[PDB]
Design a protein around this ligand. Structure first.
Ligand SMILES: [Cl-]
Ligand SMILES: [Cl-]
Ligand SMILES: [Zn+2]
Ligand SMILES: [Zn+2]
Lengths: 30, 21, 30, 21, 21, 30, 30, 30, 21, 30, 21, 21
């Protein structure tokens, strides 16, 4: 699960780079 | 969700665009 | 000029750690 | 917005939290 | 160590504040 | 293993963000 | 100074990778 | 100043998100 | 080149693929 | 699995910081 | 390549240094 | 401090080592 937490950080950064202007809304899993 | 899909299977930039805006 | 772009990348990472389960909404047009 | 306030001056843990939904 | 305590299980910010100077 | 090395880098950034002024001390496991 | 704050984030990461087992110390000079 | 250096550490991540399957090589004074 | 360009003004993902191995 | 994909993100960043002026080459194919 | 060697086990500063110029 | 010395001018890998334990 700590794998899940590490992944998150990467996802948040990747999404940011991909979307830029549009940006997103993020939500943590159970 | 995005974590469920992108943290078990790699999500290329093209897949990641689905969770934008 | 890319200052804000570089900073945004840090902010989304900082908020991922801060907001934990709560998550967040993020956008460029400050 | 957030950039205008956290990129021109450091935001602490407390200020950042203001943006959690 | 912080690895054993914070990589095995998740550590909150309030728990990491333990490793601050 | 690697993930310990990788998680270590995440702790370092997470500690940077929370120690604020006080700063921090960091020593890797064996 | 976020200039030094942002740069700090990158500095703590570089030390982690350069110091190895020896670890490191990070100070925030007010 | 380290404006280029900071920027470059993010660009690398951006180059990574695009290349991945194909990779890339980097040079400081492009 | 790409660096100065992408650090002076924000670059679009698509242009970066020209640099993949 | 995303382990190696994430590890890649870390490798590209570390080679950037560690190599400085000498830049680097990240290879996967040959 | 760099993934096979440095993601199966940790590469030291020296090992990574081999990918520089 | 590292900041003054390293955010002013890019710090060499060995100049960064003067901050290792
Ligand atoms: Cl990771
Ligand atoms: Cl930056
Ligand atoms: Zn990671
Ligand atoms: Zn940065």
């Amino acid at each position: 699960f700590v794998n899940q937490h590490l992944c998150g950080s990467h996802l948040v950064e990747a999404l940011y780079l991909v979307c830029x202007e549009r940006x997103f809304f993020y939500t943590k899993p159970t | 969700g995005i974590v469920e899909q992108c943290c078990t299977s790699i999500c290329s930039l093209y897949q990641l665009e689905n969770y934008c805006n």
